[PDB]
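In response to the reviewer comment on reproducibility (Comment 2.3), we provide here a single inverse folding case reported in full, input and output, so that an independent group could reproduce the run without further information from us. The structure tokens appear first.
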């Protein structure tokens, strides 16, 4: 289910094909280690939550989208709905994702 963005024009379409179901983005680096080290946690949800949408952005080949959210520390989790930001929390905290999803579920 998870999907990696590509550019700005894309980041838009994704939010347009995700209907309105929870849309949680994972702004982190794919090249870095400790960043993609939290993958078996955010990426393993593609099976558990089959109704929620999950996206992944690389702050290296898509800095255009990262610099758009004005991030300040990776990894940075963002919440989008209908194409509007409703939640956003950064930190290497993965156990927070779950509960957080229960927030906009």
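Designed residues, in position order:
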């Amino acid at each position: 289910m998870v999907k990696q963005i590509e550019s700005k024009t894309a980041f838009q379409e994704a939010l347009d094909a995700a209907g309105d179901k929870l849309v949680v983005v994972d702004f982190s680096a794919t090249w870095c280690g400790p960043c993609k080290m939290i993958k078996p946690f955010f990426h393993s949800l593609s099976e558990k939550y089959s109704n929620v949408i999950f996206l992944e952005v690389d702050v290296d080949d898509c800095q255009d989208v990262a610099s758009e959210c004005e991030v300040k520390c990776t990894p940075t989790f963002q919440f989008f709905k209908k194409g509007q930001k409703v939640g956003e929390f950064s930190g290497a905290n993965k156990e927070k994702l779950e509960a957080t999803i229960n927030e906009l579920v």
